[PDB]
RNA sequence: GAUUCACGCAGUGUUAACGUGCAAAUUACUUGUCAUAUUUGAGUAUAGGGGCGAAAGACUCAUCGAACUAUCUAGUAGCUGG
RNA sequence: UGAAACUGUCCUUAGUGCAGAUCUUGGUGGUAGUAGCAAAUACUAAGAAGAGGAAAAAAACAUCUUAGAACUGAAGAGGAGAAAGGUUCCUAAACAACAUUACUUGGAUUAGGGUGAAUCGAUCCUAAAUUACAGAUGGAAAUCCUUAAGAAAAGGAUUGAAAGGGAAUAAGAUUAAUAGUUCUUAAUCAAGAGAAAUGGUAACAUAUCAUGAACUUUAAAAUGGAGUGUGAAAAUCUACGGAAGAGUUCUCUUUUCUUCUUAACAAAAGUAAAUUCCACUGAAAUGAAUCAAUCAGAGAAGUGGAAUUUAUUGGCUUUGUAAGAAAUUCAAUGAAUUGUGGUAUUUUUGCAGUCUUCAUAAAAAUUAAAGGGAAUCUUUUGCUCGUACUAAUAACCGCAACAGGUCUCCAAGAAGCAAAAUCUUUAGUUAAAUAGAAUAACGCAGGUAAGGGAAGUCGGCAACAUAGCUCUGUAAGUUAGCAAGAAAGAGUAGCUCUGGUGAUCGAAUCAGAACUUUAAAGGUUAGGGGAAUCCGACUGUUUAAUAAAAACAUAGCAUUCUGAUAAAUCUAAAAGGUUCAUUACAGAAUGUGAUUUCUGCCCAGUGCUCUG
RNA sequence: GGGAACGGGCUUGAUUGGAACGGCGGGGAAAGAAGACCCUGUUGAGCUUGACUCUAAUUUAUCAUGUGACACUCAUUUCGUUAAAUGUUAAAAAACAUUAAAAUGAAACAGGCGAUUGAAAGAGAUAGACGGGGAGUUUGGCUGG
RNA sequence: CUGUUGCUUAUAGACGAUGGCAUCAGAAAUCGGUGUUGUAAGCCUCUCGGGUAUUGAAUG
RNA sequence: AAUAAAAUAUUACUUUGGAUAGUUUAGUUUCCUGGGCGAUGAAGAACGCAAUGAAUUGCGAUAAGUGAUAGGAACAAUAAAAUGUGAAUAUCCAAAAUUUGAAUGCUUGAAAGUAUACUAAGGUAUAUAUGAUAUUCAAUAUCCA
């Protein structure tokens, strides 16, 4: 087999020193540098991973399109649909209860 | 002779607290008008494990009384607290588990925890796992109340000293027998450097006052006065009694 | 193993060059110079070191300005 | 390939060459040598031939 | 090391420059006693300690 | 914080080699151990009647029952040598 | 002999007379042409260069090329880095000294040459920690404090990582030596310049689109380990079909071997695995499923959808780059080729759930989104510093080319359970403190041995011996978990067959049957076993360099003090410090040392204590 | 033999050919080290202890002038905050809450930022106790060792 | 006369020494005798085969 | 008994070594005269500069030296060029005076850097403490409408 060497001067297998050995022209293999695996967005209430948003590095969200870093809904990109649905029902039902309980019962 | 290990502990070089992953300081919120004369509501967002302490810690979020924003707190969780719970702090708070009330509002016989020794000092007594203080009696003549500390001693505090109603969570932690020296080694991961304790009799005369001779023995009485200088105060200090009590 | 063997791991410098006196006497972890007594404003001199005084003192260098003022 | 002052940077070396020799520069790479001098690799525009520029200097 | 500070590299270059012998023309001066430089060193003989 | 083998590490025995040595502590075989009380780098913290020590008066730059260095100091010597 | 100063007498003066002090400094003998130049398997033939293999064999001859023969054996004697070194790197001339012979060789002498970055790092951020002004403290030097003490800093100052976090570059070619740095081609990033939208029931989706200030919130950067299953890639192995070259060939072999490749960044023909959500319906005769689990009326299964992860866009094939490169051939610059598969093994990289903790396993720079509703394609630039070489049986630390020590990355075949021992391929090397003849004693290292079998010896020290796998079998004792691989016994080769274990052709694995032989684990690797007693309960640690243990630790047990302005305790002092980001299930000080059983009598003496 | 009582040298004898190679371990009371065992120094050091003499830490008493006759706070102590409403008058719901309308809204004043301790306690001076935690030093002579 | 030297000399041997021969010398293969192993390679038979055999063996 | 190879002894010559003699631009001591540094940036450190330099000496981007004043014909190891229209040489003078260092805008490890204002670059200034003056303020601290 073909053995390879690090290209940069980092000699230790740290988290930021990940490599991939891929085949090149002529049969020789070159060394790449692979990105770290990143987490996604979580709902602020239930801590569940949000859908519709990619799991990329924080600085790479700026390069994405405007619609690719959020969801077209209230609290989109910070609250899940279950998280939001309870917020709406909490807001309406509590105010309605206050209207009859107090406020000229 | 040399300096004993008890003396080297006071300089605090390798004996400093291993408090790097600790959540923070666990205490009540700073006392303001809205808690002296009214009540505030806090949401228990999460319950976490504070390294180095046996009881869980609660991340309570009070909204704000005077400005716009949030007030993120860090309480010592009472047993029975759950995520999403509403707790209330204030003079007019109801007598429920987890609420923080002035000690004078608690009826006699109430079980409280995280009691303040001085009003507004954010909790001193009854903070370890499963520990609590009991309200003994009130005294409205001088605005003072009596409570029973977890050690059995009685203490007289101002009636507006604050405490949380309930038991500190995590009780029964010390009833489980450590079996391995490794488990005891991990217990002090977020604590001080104390664990592997070499007996004084096993040392040399230079190292310890117990450092013996040809046979491992102390040689002199192990009960000492409180006025003994550091470096000779090894053993039992001001021991009223001694031996297997009956 | 306290002799030949233990010397193999000596590849970390205790002292580097000093900015004020030019000697390899700057302790990195102490952040001060063992020879000239750096950041301390006064140059480090001791009466028991009589030879160290005649190794770096007035007249042991170029005397760029004082060689003209005294002769004037 | 020139030998310059270490205190001059890539932008000062670039301007000095156009001023002194009347050429167009598209790239300057510099390295500091052990003896202290700064070696500059000044590349000229394709519309300018360095063969005549070097001859005028006296290299050839 | 490959990685070094700029001023440290210039002090390395000076030690290279000073590791040279007396030029021939200097040795032919009248009343000359300087034939070999005694402040000379080699990498494998004496470590310059910087 | 089970049993073993390997990469590594140690140092049980030979009281083997060597003992003006490869080496101011190493070599060979045998043996043991070989991931959670594990191994290890770098950064950092602790300094001499002090530090650090799972404790051997161990370790603190081949120096430790009190380091190294310089000054007092040409310390004193009823003792040895000239 | 030597070539420029000196002597005799009287007084004066003394750093004034040497055989010794293990005297000091320098020089020099015998020992003595003696001990040695013996680890790292190994060299040989022809030719060249050179003063340097001559000769009655003076039996040996340094460098380079070729041929033979070999070693390290891919956890390497291979290819690269961090620290350390500092020019040792490359070339030419030259060999006085140096590398225990010699050297035409060299990490040695002399002289030249060599290190190219918007994209790699430093620079930037913070971690453990570190240091300022003012203040506090001190006789002093100076110490303390790091946001508390302040008319200082919207909230708190400096430094601290070339392994942590982090905007963005790849392939090919090129040099005597540098190259994610130069050249060619192709990219990317940052900073600049030229009354406010739709679609889907929904999850959510639309080459910028489709405004979004103060303020606030959320998420990311950013989080242990074990073990199981599995997706993809690469390497190895292999099936089908070949093209080109090479090896063997009087004995066969439609044969053995080699090449058949392709980046960053983007595209979207075709098509996956896993997980989480959404719509319809409402499950009991309970179903669904995994290697294991696990799940369901706070809603299963089914049907149809949405999203995200899978080493860049979007995982894989494919496409642009792009064959014009490169590889392998052929001719004398020009021509040829560059399919398709695998229910195989290993490594790498993700994923999914399971387990484990009196352990819960970083922060900041910086980025995005939300709530709110204040206001109304082309082109330019990209600064500073490091960048050579070794990274070790010769470039580092040990006085040295020292068998010692010193952090990592990549990783072929056979055989095997195995990254074991052994052999080989790519790469490196045949030199690494000199050899030739002879073949005494005595050695060091490795072996064997008649008959006996520990009689030797303080003592089975040393050596021998056992040893892999399958089947049968396995005692006392016991904390019921073990003892246990107890002990003990049988089998094992080669060749020719049969059967079992799957999917809509393939895996090595298991069982059985004939026949033959030198009767089969044994080349390498590879437990000796049993019966008692003493100590320590166990895993662990220890006197670096004569003690590895019964010593230390340990869990268990027990005792003492302490309500925090405290206990212990550092400091000369201190709005000083540590346990303490703590609060009796805690902090501090001790003794004994797992479990079982039991801890008897004594308060006179010395301690300690008293609510006197 | 005698001698310092175990000679290579001296006395008397035995005896002797000069130069040495390979071994060898009897001797050279062989080399290595101003004996480490023992004793003597009016020589030390580590450790111990009601050895002698002291000392840090701890402790107790007195002094160091806050007011009114126990009460107060005013120095002092220990704290807490963004010095964020002090004092006197007048448990159904893990959601949002801010940049105000309107014609002040959103009340005034105190000589105390809010508590705690308190003329007591801390630090100083002097005096008694304690104090191997620690410092300095000593630990006779004769003597069939 | 003796010594060196040669037979990579033996009845000898650490090196010296000792012993033998030195042109009718010596050395060498080959062959025969003598041993060891066990029946070669090409096609059970060829096959008591093949191979080795002084190196410190014995003839020519 | 015998040989003198080795051994020993003396002299001459030579060698290894560097004593002795002769010599001194170096020291030691005493005395005399001063005791003349620095924010106008010192002492010290680093780096750089000669036609051929490595050290040392001298000097600082005007570099083994510039101007002025004295001075009057050299320097040399080699070659150049200049020179009585002034070479060497000397100086309390003039100009100039790199990076640091009390080091002082901020940072500084071996660190590369970086902010603001004035006058793209370049050059200045900006530490702490402190005296005087001016100016802008703060505190009902005292009066005070």
Swiss-Prot record, chain B:
Residues 206-246 are annotated as: Disordered. GO terms for biological process: cytoplasmic translation. PROSITE patterns: RIBOSOMAL_L2. It comes from the Eukaryota. Its main location: cytoplasm. Keywords: Cytoplasm, Ribonucleoprotein, Ribosomal protein. GO terms for molecular function: RNA binding; structural constituent of ribosome. Coiled coil: none annotated. It is found in: Cytoplasm. GO terms for cellular component: cytosolic large ribosomal subunit. NCBIfam families: PRK09612.1 (NF007180). Component of the large ribosomal subunit. PANTHER family: LARGE RIBOSOMAL SUBUNIT PROTEIN UL2 (PTHR13691:SF16), RIBOSOMAL PROTEIN L2 (PTHR13691). Belongs to the universal ribosomal protein uL2 family. Component of the large ribosomal subunit. The ribosome is a large ribonucleoprotein complex responsible for the synthesis of proteins in the cell. This is Large ribosomal subunit protein uL2. It comes from Entamoeba histolytica (strain ATCC 30459 / HM-1:IMSS / ABRM).
């Amino acid at each position: 087999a073909v053995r390879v060497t690090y290209v940069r001067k980092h000699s230790y297998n740290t988290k930021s020193n990940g490599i991939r050995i891929v085949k090149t022209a002529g049969g020789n293999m070159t060394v790449q540098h692979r990105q770290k695996i990143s987490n996604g967005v979580r709902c602020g209430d239930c801590g569940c991973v949000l859908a519709g948003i990619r799991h990329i590095r924080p600085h790479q969200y700026g390069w994405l399109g405007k619609s690719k870093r959020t969801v077209t809904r209230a609290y989109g990109g910070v609250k899940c649909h279950k998280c939001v649905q309870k917020k709406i029902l909490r807001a309406f039902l509590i105010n309605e209860h206050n209207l009859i309980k107090l406020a000229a019962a | 002779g040399r300096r004993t290990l008890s003396q080297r502990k006071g300089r605090g070089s390798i004996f400093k607290s291993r408090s790097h992953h600790k959540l923070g300081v666990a205490q009540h919120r700073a006392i303001d008008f809205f808690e002296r004369h009214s009540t505030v509501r806090g949401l228990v967002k999460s319950i976490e494990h504070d390294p180095g302490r046996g009881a869980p810690l609660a991340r309570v979020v009070f909204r704000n009384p005077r400005q716009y924003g949030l007030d993120k707190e860090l309480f010592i969780c009472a047993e029975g607290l759950y995520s999403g719970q509403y707790i209330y702090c204030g003079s007019k708070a109801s007598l429920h588990i987890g609420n923080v009330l002035p000690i004078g509002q608690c009826p006699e016989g109430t079980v409280v925890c995280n009691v303040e020794s001085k009003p507004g000092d954010r909790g001193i007594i009854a903070r370890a796992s499963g520990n609590y203080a009991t309200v003994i009696s009130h005294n409205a003549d001088n605005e003072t109340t009596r409570i029973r500390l977890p050690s059995g001693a009685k203490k007289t505090l101002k009636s507006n000293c604050r405490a949380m109603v309930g038991i500190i969570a995590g009780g029964g932690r010390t009833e489980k027998p450590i079996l391995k020296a490794g488990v005891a080694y991990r217990m002090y991961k977020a604590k001080r450097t104390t664990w592997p304790r070499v007996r004084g009799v096993a040392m040399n005369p230079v190292d310890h006052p117990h450092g013996g001779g040809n046979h491992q023995h102390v040689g002199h009485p192990t009960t000492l006065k409180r006025s003994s200088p550091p470096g000779q105060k090894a053993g039992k200090v001001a021991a009223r009694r001694t031996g297997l009590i009956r | 193993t306290k002799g030949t063997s233990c010397r193999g791991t000596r590849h970390n410098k205790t002292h580097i060059l000093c900015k004020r006196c030019g000697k390899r006497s700057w302790h990195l972890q102490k952040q001060r110079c063992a020879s000239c007594g750096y950041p301390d404003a006064k140059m480090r001199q001791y009466a028991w070191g009589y030879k160290a005084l005649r190794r770096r003192t007035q007249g042991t260098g170029r005397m760029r300005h004082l060689k003209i003022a005294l002769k004037r | 390939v020139f030998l310059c002052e270490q205190k001059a940077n890539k932008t000062m070396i670039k301007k000095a060459v156009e001023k002194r020799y009347g050429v167009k520069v598209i790239k300057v790479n510099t390295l500091v040598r052990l003896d202290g001098l700064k070696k500059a690799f000044v590349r000229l525009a394709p519309d300018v031939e360095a063969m005549e520029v070097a001859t005028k200097i006296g290299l050839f | 090391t490959g990685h070094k500070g700029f001023s440290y590299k210039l002090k390395l270059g000076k030690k290279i420059h000073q590791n040279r012998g007396v030029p021939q023309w200097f040795r032919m001066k009248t009343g000359n006693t300087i034939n070999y430089n005694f402040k000379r060193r080699h990498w494998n003989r004496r470590k310059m300690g910087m």
